[PDB]
Design a binder for this molecule. Structure first.
Ligand SMILES: COCCOc1cc(N2[C@@H]3CC[C@H]2CN(c2cc(-c4ccccc4O)nnc2N)C3)ccn1
Ligand SMILES: [Zn+2]
Ligand SMILES: [Zn+2]
Length: 113
């Protein structure tokens, strides 16, 4: 339904647009994965690569049957950032915050059970 798509887009836009107390947009690095030719090491280590552009494409093309499916893909993105990057590094830390930002956005926008 158009309502579900509106909610998914509103949730992902909250995640994308989020800035920390310093005004930095944390999603910046995660919008588009570097190409396989630029960073082959990433694709050698990460089995299911995904970025925010792909998640937007999947919402747009009606590929998520529920908000749970959308969540699964956002969590996979953050997991891959944490798998590839060192614990304590900025990319690693940013992905942890974005998991939390998605959950707050889902609770606020969707107002479920
Ligand atoms: C147009 O911009 C697209 C990205 O541009 C880039 C960015 C590159 N970077 C190198 C180091 C910093 C930045 C982002 N980097 C990473 C990106 C990601 C990543 C990006 C999107 C989605 C999930 C991810 O885990 N994960 N770990 C990284 N270390 C790779 C390397 C080559 N092209
Ligand atoms: Zn690049
Ligand atoms: Zn459509």
């Amino acid at each position: 339904p158009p309502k579900l798509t509106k909610q998914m887009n509103a949730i992902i836009d909250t995640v994308i647009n989020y800035k920390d107390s310093s005004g930095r947009q944390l999603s910046e690095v995660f919008i588009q994965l570097p190409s396989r030719k630029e960073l082959p090491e990433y694709y050698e280590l990460i089995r299911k690569p995904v970025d925010f552009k792909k998640i937007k494409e999947r919402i747009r093309n009606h590929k998520y049957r529920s908000l749970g499916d959308l969540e699964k893909d956002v969590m996979l993105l953050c997991h891959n950032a944490q798998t590839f990057n060192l614990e304590g590094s900025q990319i690693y830390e940013d992905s942890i915050v974005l998991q939390s930002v998605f959950k707050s956005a889902r609770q606020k926008i969707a107002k479920e059970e």
